[PDB]
């Protein structure tokens with residue numbers, strides 16, 4: 362559908378830009394099955410990593426790097442993968458994961474994507490995020 366043009370547009374951004382956009386999408390939310398327990402499990406592991414390790418782990422998930430953790434994430438359902446990304450972002454907010462650069466100004470090319478997405482349907486907006494995270498991890 363149209364969500365394809367978005368996911369591909371999103372994927373055609375820098376790895377550090379993609380994270381930045383995903384992050385702001387999360388902030389704009391507060392101002393086939395899913396298995397939640399498994400998702401928090403992976404998160405717990407990531408929580409043990411230091412901040413650098415936690416950033417690279419996210420860069421790795423996008424770049425499809427072959428980690429021991431990238432493999433765990435790859436073996437998850439599409440719906441639980443998204444839940445896991447929410448746990449990371451929530452984690453950053455709760456000081457338990459690498460905080461976002463205060464000085465990071467978002468590019469205007471992603472400021473557009475942010476706006477276009479906000480105008481999307483709730484169902485679609487969900488499918489967009491779900492379609493974005495599934496093509497990640499290893500294997």
Ligand SMILES: CC1=C(/C=C/C(C)=C/C=C/C(C)=C/C=C/C=C(C)/C=C/C=C(C)/C=C/C2=C(C)C(=O)CCC2(C)C)C(C)(C)CCC1=O
Pocket residue numbers: 376377378380381383384386387395416419440441443444445446447449450459460461462465487490
């Ligand atoms: C520090 C630093 C940085 C790093 C920045 C970093 C680390 C940025 C990381 C940003 C992160 C972790 C963004 C995550 C966003 C998650 C979203 C929007 C979740 C949507 C979930 C939904 C819609 C729920 C869906 C669903 C779920 C799951 C269910 O399970 C059932 C409900 C429902 C169906 C609705 C930079 C790269 C910027 C610079 C370098 C540098 O130093």
